């Protein structure tokens, strides 16, 4: 588990807020709260099931061992030398180690791991990417090679495969009307948006939840999409840089490629603001039925 980069780090804080805070009149003060490290209220259930998300998308806790596991805490501090002075670091890894091995409900592992964030609160957040100074210092440095706050990932993945001025620009005319271009350069593009948007894990596998996600976000059912995907996974690729491409190509050819188009569209839109669901709860609208950089596309 680990390293992660500020946009990882961002996209787990803002998933697992997006799925744990509540629906009434605590929603606002509770995001006040997340947002800046503050783990409260402590009795709350959706402060517990947020932090228990937070663990597990980072592997500080493991839910198959039933335990905490410090390793990601060296994996990151190993990737980013300048967010932690190691003394503290080896500090915040051994507290994470001591703890002892824990229940697989919300509750547990939150009252288990909140005297470690207390107590290594500036630890832990300098290195998971939550010091607002230190992150705005690495976004700089890494500009157009991370996804930047505020970019939709698609845009993010066009201008490193289809940079804007170049003879390749032009390409996005067709890219972005679903045409499944068979390049080593499309595929290259396509992986990047299908990982961005965590329909394909670090290690080139299906997650089929995550697409699943999508279209019920669309208000569409997900019975005929398991059935595409299973098929699809069924002639997966051997070689995994394809794989990817393969799936994107498989849905964008299947029955449900409405359905799929439309969610995947509500994505691209989301992707623009990892907080969108945040302040409240979006309702989706489909919009109404081309340009790149005002240029007019020949199709
Ligand atoms: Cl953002």
């Not at 976000?217 to 491409?245: G, H, I, M, Q, R």
Request: hydrophobic letters at 30%; aromatic letters at 12%.
């Amino acid at each position: 588990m680990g390293p992660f980069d500020p946009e990882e780090m961002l996209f787990i804080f803002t998933r697992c807020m997006e799925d744990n805070l509540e629906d009434g009149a605590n929603r606002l003060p509770m995001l006040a709260k997340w947002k800046e490290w503050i783990n409260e209220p402590v009795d709350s259930p959706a402060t517990q099931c947020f932090g228990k998300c937070v663990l597990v998308r980072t592997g500080l806790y493991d839910p198959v061992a039933q335990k905490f596991d410090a390793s990601v805490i060296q994996e990151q501090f190993k990737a980013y030398p300048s967010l932690g002075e190691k003394s503290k670091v080896e500090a915040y890894a051994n507290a994470v180690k001591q703890l002892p091995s824990t229940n697989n409900d919300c509750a547990a592992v939150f009252k288990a791991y909140d005297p470690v964030h207390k107590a290594h609160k500036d630890t832990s957040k300098n290195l998971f990417h939550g010091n607002k100074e230190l992150t705005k210092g690495l976004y700089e440095k890494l500009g157009k090679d991370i996804r930047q706050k505020k970019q939709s990932y698609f845009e993010f993945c066009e201008n490193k495969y289809y940079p804007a001025g170049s003879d390749k620009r032009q390409q996005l005319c067709q890219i972005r009307q679903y045409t499944v271009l068979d390049d080593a350069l499309f595929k290259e593009h396509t992986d990047c948006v299908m990982k961005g948007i965590r329909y394909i894990t670090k290690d080139n596998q299906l997650d089929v939840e995550e697409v699943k996600r999508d279209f019920k976000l669309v208000n569409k059912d997900t019975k005929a999409l398991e059935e595409v995907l299973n098929d699809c996974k069924s002639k997966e690729p051997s070689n995994a840089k394809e794989k990817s491409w393969h799936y994107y190509k498989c849905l964008v050819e299947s029955s449900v490629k409405d359905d799929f188009k439309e969610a995947f569209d509500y994505r691209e839109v989301r992707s623009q603001i990892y907080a969108f669901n945040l302040p409240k709860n979006q309702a989706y609208s489909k919009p109404a039925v081309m340009e790149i950089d005002g240029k007019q596309c020949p199709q």
